[model samples]
Target: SVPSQKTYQGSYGFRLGFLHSGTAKSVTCTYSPALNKLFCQLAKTCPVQLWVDSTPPPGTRVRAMAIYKQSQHMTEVVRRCPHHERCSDSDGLAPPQHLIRVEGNLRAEYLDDRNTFRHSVVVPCEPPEVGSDCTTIHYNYMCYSSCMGGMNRRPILTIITLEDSSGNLLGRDSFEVRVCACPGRDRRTEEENLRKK
Candidate 1:
């Protein structure tokens, strides 16, 4: 099992849910924004995970819906099991209970490091629709933008504008989300877990 607590940069985001094995014990989770890291505990006998949510980094788009613990890789597309419903189980063995259903517009950019260009989808947000429960939980960069095609820059992740708004992709919201760990008492830190089991 991973350490009861994982030292993560809180800059990623908050915990959402967990994918766990049948025998796994849920771990305690916590977030430290000052240090930008997350701490969590996993069981010795059972596998466990804590899902986190945050924004994307600069020059990148939040293309993946979630990241896995064991693989430590991006789960780009949400699975279709549970009939497109969100479910979370150990090993991503089950569907997410509540799908953080994501959709966006395709955008692209080129980089010199890899000697290639990349593309991503930009999530769009409209001014709060009546009774819209959507709210900003955590964010990093706030960009100033101009209206193009009558669209004003908004809080929802957008890629049309850049952080400085000097280029065609002038301004947009960028952030990251760390899955499988949330800061809370119910959630156990990795250490608390190691001691318990």
Candidate 2:
């Protein structure tokens, strides 16, 4: 379905007070119901402005705007940690003690710059659910050095359900991840050995 654009006459506030102080020009504003927030795009002439109370004009009806048929919302919490490698304890070997794990029951939809869904994956959550939860995400040394084959610092949108049947915020979290390389075996060395066989 094609996205529908409807205009709204509403007043929003900026901390810098540029809107009401007459510094902004060519202003456009819109509200998102899903996000429960107002967004404005405008130009400002100068920096001198005092904060003022701005309210929507009388009899101005607020309507939700959707630029696309579907949209996903994500809240980002920045987390930084060291790179760790793959581990196996099946043979009684202890894994790294400083292992970091970012857990959440969030839904993530990978998208490109065009705001289109590229892929989907279920992330970890607070109250663990069996068979539907993602296990630990690993980060290898290469992730720190080379950014996991150039996927480092990329943005991923994850939707967290704060409310259930009744509206109530649950909780929130954040994380970073990189692919794990095989332990004790470099790819080049392994290939060279194979060729010698």
Candidate 3:
């Protein structure tokens, strides 16, 4: 199906927002304005994807990395942690947090009827940690390619839903987060061994 007239272009240096009602307590971000606004969603407790345009606008650009944060309140409350500080006190006590899990790329199709292009993809996330202070979480997503080559731009789509173990919406008043998308170019492989330049 085609998205409504609303569309978001993800550019560099802009700030985007995020919210979810299911597990995460809260989420947010910064992104470039040149980017599109019809990219992601702002519903609470919804599954989401932090997408960025591989091709940046005129001057500024994406930092070439995916960034994320989990709220101490959500993780602490649900996981039954004493405090947020103690959650990160030990080196290996709290497992690392991942806001956005990588989903393979999909092609962008131009829909003449809607007068907009279409891209579909999903970002799988890990559940909040139990017995920890990291209640809510945020995800920073970016894409890279050795060369634009046949890939000047890669459109991304992130699906979101609000439900519990039995498939029920937790409602609009409980917990929430807002999400916006960005655009950047990056390598195509799934290796996290890249050194910062």
What is each predicted model's overall lDDT from 0 to 1?
Answer: 0.26, 0.24, 0.23
> Which ranges of candidate 2 are over 4 A from the true structure?
1-169, 182-197
State each model's C-alpha RMSD to the native.
16.5, 21.4, 20.1
Could you give candidate 1's per-residue lDDT for residues 1-197 as a string of tens digits? 11112323244342322233221244443433322333332211111122225443444332112222233322222122342233233232211321122212223222211221122222322222467423222211111112221112221121122121222222222222223323243234534565677
Whole-model lDDT, model 3: 0.23
Per-candidate TM-score against the hidden true structure: 0.24, 0.18, 0.22
Q: Give, for candidate 1, the lowest lDDT window spanning 10 residues.
A: 142-151
* lDDT score for candidate 1 against the true structure: 0.26
Location of the lowest summed lDDT over 10 successive residues in candidate 2: 61-70
TM-score of 2: 0.18
Q: Least accurate stretch of 10 residues (summed lDDT) in model 3?
A: 183-192
The best candidate in terms of TM-score: 1
Off by over 4 Å in 3: 1-99, 102-136, 145-152, 168-197
